[PDB]
Amino acid sequence: TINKLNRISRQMLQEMGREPLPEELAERMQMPEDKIRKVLKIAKEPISMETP
């Protein structure tokens, strides 16, 4: 789901020139906006506690 999210964001960014918003990115993936946000708010790779 995350990979498809990124791929469709890539296609829409190429097509319309801007970064897709969570509204427009919902209809092309036929999946609800709330779940789009839920996938987006998934915690990314944690930042190390050693970073300068």
Add this chain to the structure above:
Amino acid sequence: YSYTEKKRIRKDFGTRPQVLDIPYLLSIQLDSFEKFIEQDPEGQYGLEAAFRSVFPIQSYNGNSELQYVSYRLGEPVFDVKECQIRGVTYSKPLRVKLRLVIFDKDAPAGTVKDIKEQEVYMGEIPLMTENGTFVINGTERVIVSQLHRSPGVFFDSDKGKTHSSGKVLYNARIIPYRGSWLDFEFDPKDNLYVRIDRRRKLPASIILRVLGKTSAEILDIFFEKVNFEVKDQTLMMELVPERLRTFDIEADGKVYVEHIRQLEKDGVNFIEVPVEYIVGKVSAKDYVNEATGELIITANQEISLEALANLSQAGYKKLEVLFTNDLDHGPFMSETLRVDSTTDRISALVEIYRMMRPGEPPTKEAAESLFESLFFSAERYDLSTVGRMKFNSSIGREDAEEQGTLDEVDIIEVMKKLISIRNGKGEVDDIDHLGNRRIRSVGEMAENQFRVGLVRVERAVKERLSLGDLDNVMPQDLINAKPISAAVKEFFGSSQLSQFMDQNNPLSEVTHKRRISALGPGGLTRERAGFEVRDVHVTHYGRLCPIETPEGPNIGLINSLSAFARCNEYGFLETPYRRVVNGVVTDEVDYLSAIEEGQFVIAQANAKLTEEGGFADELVTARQKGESGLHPREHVDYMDVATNQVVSIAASLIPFLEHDDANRALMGANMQRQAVPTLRSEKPLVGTGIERNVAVDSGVTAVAKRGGVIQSVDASRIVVKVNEEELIPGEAGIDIYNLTKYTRSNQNTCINQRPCVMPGEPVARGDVLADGPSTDLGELALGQNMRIAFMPWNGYNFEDSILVSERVVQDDRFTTIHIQELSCVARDTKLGAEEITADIPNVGEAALSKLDESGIVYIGAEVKGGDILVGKVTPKGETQLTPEEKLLRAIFGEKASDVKDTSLRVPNSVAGTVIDVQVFTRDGVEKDKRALEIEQMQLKEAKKDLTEEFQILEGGLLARVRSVLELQNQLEQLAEQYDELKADFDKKFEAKRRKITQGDDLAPGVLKIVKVYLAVKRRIQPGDKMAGRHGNKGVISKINPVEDMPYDENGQPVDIVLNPLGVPSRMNIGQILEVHLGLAAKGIGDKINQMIKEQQELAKLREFLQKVYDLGDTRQRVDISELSDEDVRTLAHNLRAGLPVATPVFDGAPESSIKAMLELADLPASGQLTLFDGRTGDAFERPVTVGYMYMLKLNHLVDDKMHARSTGSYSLVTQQPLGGKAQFGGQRFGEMEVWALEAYGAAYTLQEMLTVKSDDVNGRTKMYKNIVDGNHAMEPGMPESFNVLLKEIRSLGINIELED
């Protein structure tokens, strides 16, 4: 004189006419980035080069390719101001036209079937503001130029630190712009070795074998040949006369010393030699007998006695051998061939593949592509144009101007030149020479990172084309803009050279945009830097300022561009010089670099010139090869263009710099960048004349783009009606300047633009309309003029302490405005959504008095520490309350709520006025009431300029309608133009309203953001750091009452009392001269004030002004008779507070002029007055130096340095107190404090500071309870860090334990 300069003319004490005006201070940034973005038809600079370096993209199979046509940058979404407001990057979209072409497998290659061309988006390029800054993530940033090693070949040595022998090992090293390093060194046994990518050494001959060089060819290139023949059964030399200059000489009478010049006047082509002369010599060719079929003697083999006989029996009569000396020529290459183990090209390739890839099985084809990729491949090796020119200059090559890869002749000449240096001919290159170091600016760095991103996309595009399925694919399917955008964002946001913009004052602006750093990517390291790089090389004259380099670890590693320094087309610093012809000196100038500087002699501005325009002294001071000396007048070639050429802008603002030690001048230059703007900006009484340039070129001021008359003036807007000579046809005719009012800087300092114009007066181009921070009437104004007495006062100016009157505290001369940001972010959590509301539990009504209905404080609310700014409630989980707590709840009621108070409160010891509130809401979230009110406020503020423009356009149109009143045709035309204007206004307002109403792209998880701006007026108090411009810093020790401070005969008390003890030891005498000159200037100012007061006739005022401006033999010719009556009155009004005087650096006012102005002001010639003690009334028995000095308030305040803590937050792992005021941390008790307590014998204090105060978790709670009870006893336990250590050691499989 310009209008803004005619209002307050600064008296100039310089004597040398100025030939070259100081150029734009920020050209180093603007020119670089313009080169980066502007179109390049020849494609050597800018994004064109980056696109042409990677494109076209070839697939592995060759079925298809992607080609590049052109590029453009679109219209930005926002402008700079709102990009700062929302917190987004100011950038333009890159749109590149590409064509996809497909080649058939059956048909021959190069046949075009169909082309698919279109415009694809490949990221957003951050633009540079006119002032030379970037807006990244809403913050202003500066890209700092880098001083790096120039690409090319560098010849250096060891100096003899490798081995105890007196021998010096020499080496050469080639640095490519992109590629792998290659070194040629000498070992301490006279052999030359090669090093690729800093690997283990290899004989140099390997890099020749791999290049198709047989041993005979190697000996041919690297040695000279001496030949022998067998004539009439006799051995025979050849004739080279220079070689001989001792067994005998077979030239009959030309014989010698069984000096050669004696009979070298006569020549004969024959010399006979014994057999013994050849035994010690080495061969040069390979000799094979057909009859024997074997190899008798090999090349580079020592010839033996039997070798001659066997060769003679073979029939060979000509024998050529090498030429070897002990001084001029050496056996280095021959011995290197003798120590190599290879014999053929492929064996050497195997050796270098084994070394390059240790342990890999020897593969031949891999070897070939490896070597071809190492240096001879354009993809992995690139010697830039600058590197190519440095290469062609170092080895003397004169061709291959566009080649970027090494070839045969390059390595051949590098070896030849290094061997020539080992022989004695030639010298090493200076590593710190500015001709060997280059300036790399924003354009080049952006090009490099853009090319990295382009390569990132190139890989994937090549792979996709290599798939081959190409039927319906338009080019916006292989291009992935996200990697390129990631690369540019990484460079512009996380590079060490992309730093936050130092925004204390305009001087900080300019000095940050003209800084050169030796650190950063491809640079140096603070710990690994050496003495040589930090030192001042002689090539720095006119290129880098020798004064301002930060004190400390970064000494010498960070430099400043000099006033007139420039960057050439290659990135090397150059400085201007006036040429001399026929002994006369010409106005026009040439820019010279470090290499071009060595040849000529260069005089300097201090050299006296005659009225005929030529040198007076026969022996003038000049420089050659970095050495100063006296040279004949007719030998001169160039002269310096200005006296401030060697010093940068910050040091050019120090008056009487030539009377100060370099250390204190450096401290003053560094410390003048830390000044904080005050409420009222006042000019420096004693200046250098550079202030106008810095103020204008900093961009803080509002500069008139076109001339005209100010139609309207307001504190926020200036409208100028442009003159009808600069009006482009069809234009409205007005220009609108909106002024920044109370905007937070990067350093929490007010940025305010103040109008300095009236309605109706005329303004020209370049005139100042508004004064920004630290600017007064277009002049840079950092500090304030303070009355200064140099005398000790009861120890309150001990060391560098400063004693300050109460008058300046009451007059708010050093009060500052600080704007602070506070943010409250309402997020979404697992328990629920965090809400911003006024229904805060467990809080009364008084704390909600300043809150509105939404839960946000009003604009203009006076808040103090602990006051709620944004009311926020957070959902919380169930609490298992303790038994006594549920007793309390049962008895008193007060049932618990479901929300906890997590609200934005004003920090302690902070009290100010709320001046702005910004609410940012995620799309799809209910916009609160306050968000709506702010939206309407911004709409109302924004429609005004469009309304005024539409009104003036419609007024002009209706005036045309009335003037016209065939008739119906003109009426219809006017109506349709009116409709067009209405439509244009509607479109502009629609775009605006869309911008304000547009939602905010917040981070995931956050629902609302509220930002509060607090304004704090910080007054001057003890502990604050105050300074001058000569390195004389200090900390205020007391705010003295007025009646207690020294005063003069007229009753005027001093303002600041300074210690004289710090002047003689620190060798900053420019401060005393500044005090004397300021005394004279304020004397003249009060004389003009008097003349104004009793309304004396304008004739006497004009005479006095002319007398003042004609003092000394100076270069300034001010004609008061050429000024109007009102202009003279304005000049007299602006000179009431003192006469501004300009003393340029190294061209300053002599003591005679200072005493003359003191006499004109009716003041003592010595500058010392009789002071009286305020406490006692008794006069001091020695005269005291009293005058006026420019004081600065540095951004080192005791308000944000005072910090205190008893118990707060603790670290997660170490269980130790935090570190820092912002985190409410504790002070560090390091190793040396422990040593000091051990030396004292304080076992108990040490134990307490180790266990209870830091990490004994139970100990600190028990100690707090005991102190509250009143016991002052401790029961120490085990430190937590030792348990962490024990666990960590046990995790390494080591049994560490405590015994009983």
